[PDB]
Design a protein around this ligand. Structure first.
Ligand SMILES: O=C(O)Cn1cnc2ccccc2c1=O
Ligand SMILES: [Zn+2]
Length: 115
């Protein structure tokens, strides 16, 4: 249904050591020129573009391809982070999800969502 459910990955999510400081703006896909529709993988801090949909809309699928290679399931859409939350997608559950540990997961990358 329409309500975002808690991801089964949220509580125990692996976040790798020595993460990048993710800035508040100005990101690019590390695999192509895209500067919109960018997804920050919460395990490794990769910044990669959103899915190509079957109507031909969306990005160049770099975030989904990175999931296929790593299994790192949660990503947050850059530009959606506010004091009230963010757009979090689970590749494993194939749904938009709630991450009750979002503030801690973003703090890992030096992101203050409350700012
Ligand atoms: O685009 C991405 O790489 C992550 N993402 C984000 N939002 C979605 C919403 C519906 C269906 C698929 C997706 C999806 O794959
Ligand atoms: Zn890309």
């Amino acid at each position: 249904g329409e309500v975002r459910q808690v991801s089964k990955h949220a509580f125990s999510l692996k976040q790798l050591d020595n993460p990048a400081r993710i800035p508040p703006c100005g990101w690019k896909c590390s695999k192509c020129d895209m500067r919109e529709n960018l997804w920050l993988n919460l395990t490794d801090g990769s910044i990669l573009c959103g899915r190509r949909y079957f109507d031909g809309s969306g990005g160049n699928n770099h975030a989904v391809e990175h999931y296929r290679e790593t299994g790192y399931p949660l990503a947050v859409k850059l530009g959606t982070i506010t004091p009230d939350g963010a757009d979090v997608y689970s590749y494993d559950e194939d749904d938009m999800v709630l991450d009750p540990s979002l503030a801690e997961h973003l703090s890992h990358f030096g992101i203050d969502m409350l700012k």
